[PDB]
Structure formats: C-alpha cells, structure tokens
Amino acid sequence: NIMTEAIAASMQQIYSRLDTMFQYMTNLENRVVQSEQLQKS
Amino acid sequence: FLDREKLREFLSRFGYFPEKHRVVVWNYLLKLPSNYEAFDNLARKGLHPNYLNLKSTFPIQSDKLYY
C-alpha cells in the first residue's frame, strides 16, 4: 500500500515543485541568456 | 528545484524531467559556466571544411537538423 500510493502520491509533489524551475531559470541564469544576444550581434 | 540529492531522487521517481528545464537541471549538475562569450567566439568565423558534408556518412534528411 505504501509503495503503491503513499509513495506515488508523495512523488507527485516532485513536479508540484519542479513545474516552476523555469521561474528561476528565467531569473537564475538569464543574465547570460540575455547578454549573449548582444554579444552575438 | 536544485540540489543533486533532490534531483537524483526526482529524476528516479518522477523519472527523467521535461525539456523546458534542461537548462537548470543540467547546468546545476554539470557545473556549467554559461560561458557564452567563449561559445560565441566559436560560432562566428566563416566556412568550416571538416563538416560540410554530414549527410554523406549520416544521411538524415533534415536540412535544418544537420545544420
């Protein structure tokens, strides 16, 4: 019972949080994402 | 989000992860510098003779992917 669902349910929460990793990506590393566009041209 | 331990388990229980996040998962785990200057100076010089050419040995018929 636990290995089925207690885990599967608690493992939902992985994406519950990972779903927003992009929110940092756009604000984590973005200075580079951004600088490159000029430096390239 | 980030932390090798969280990711190790997340990537095992969720399984893999989605594409829009390749930048964060990888860059963290792989210690990437995001050395965009170094990369751009590879990108623009001109013609490169070793690989003009690729479909001859690996004939994947996509003129945008071979590019």
Swiss-Prot record, chain A:
It comes from the Eukaryota. Disruption phenotype: POC1-deficient mutant cells display a temperature-sensitive lethal phenotype. Mutant cells also exhibit reduced basal body frequency, basal body organization defects, and loss of oral apparatuses. It is found in: Cytoplasm, Cytoskeleton, Cilium basal body. Required for structural maintenance of centrioles, ciliogenesis, and cilia-based motility. Belongs to the POC1 family. This is POC1 centriolar protein homolog. It comes from Tetrahymena thermophila (strain SB210). The lineage of its organism: Eukaryota, Sar, Alveolata, Ciliophora, Intramacronucleata. The chain holds residues 530 to 570 of 634 of the full protein.
